[PDB]
Symmetry: C2
Subunit: 158 residues, 2 copies
């Protein structure tokens, strides 16, 4: 009765890293929430290397090692989600990982831009989705990290 026990792991994707505090406040909240459920956060800035390629490789490895990704696809520098987060969602999708997404703005892209085109006459997607359709996989788009985490707990038990 001392079998190996898998500790669940979630990759914490999102532009919080670009906050003035490098994501400290966001990541601390994540750490506290996950601690209660014995889930390990895999955080992009953990044991951060100095070289871009090393940072990238470590983050890809975290995605490979995770049970799920919870991705913050909130508006970043406009109505579009963060590209880095989008890359990570793509990585996870290719590796058949559970991907859970949330955003602070759930309106359709055309509601966000107020038109079928942006200010430069570039087409805004019309699929009833809050962001680029590649980022949607059929799972509900959540309103917060917490709500996404509740789905994880219900659908990925120990």
């Amino acid at each position: 009765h001392h079998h190996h026990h898998h500790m669940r792991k979630i990759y914490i994707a999102g532009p919080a890293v670009f906050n003035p505090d490098m994501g400290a406040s966001y990541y601390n909240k994540v750490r506290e929430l996950l601690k209660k459920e014995n889930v390990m956060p895999l955080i992009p800035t953990d044991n951060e290397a100095t070289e871009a390629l090393d940072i990238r490789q470590k983050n890809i490895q975290m995605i490979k090692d995770c049970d799920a990704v919870i991705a913050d696809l909130s508006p970043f520098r406009g109505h579009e989600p963060d590209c880095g987060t989008a890359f990570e969602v793509g990585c996870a999708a290719a590796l058949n990982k559970m991907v859970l997404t949330f955003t602070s703005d759930r309106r359709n892209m055309r509601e966000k831009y107020g038109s079928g085109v942006d200010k430069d006459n570039l087409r805004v997607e019309g699929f009833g989705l809050p962001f680029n359709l590649m980022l949607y996989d059929g799972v509900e788009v959540f309103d917060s990290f917490e709500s996404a985490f509740k789905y994880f707990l219900a659908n990925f038990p120990s």
Copy 2:
């Protein structure tokens, strides 16, 4: 004779799809360039489905089927590349595909934003790269589709 011959295939990732012509002018130029070298373009809008999930699945399948991705990481709706393209680059990276990227703007992110922070005091990466570090894998960032394609021809022969 009459052994099976593999036709090389390149997934054409980029926000040209959002042009007023749905990328017609871009894709036509791509088709002509690749035709000369017996390379098949895998284009996001080819045989386009109506449902978001079907379009997504077909595009993921194209990446799975490709020999390389040439991704247009040009500024889209600001200094950041397109998120959908970023997702596709992520997918390709996880699948160990050759990923080739280009941009119309090769300046470092901090040169583009003119500061180490944006207008909202959000951190701009300082790794001497033109975009989010996740999008760089050690291969040169090219100036055009054509220059990326030249690398493909030199590094993925028939």
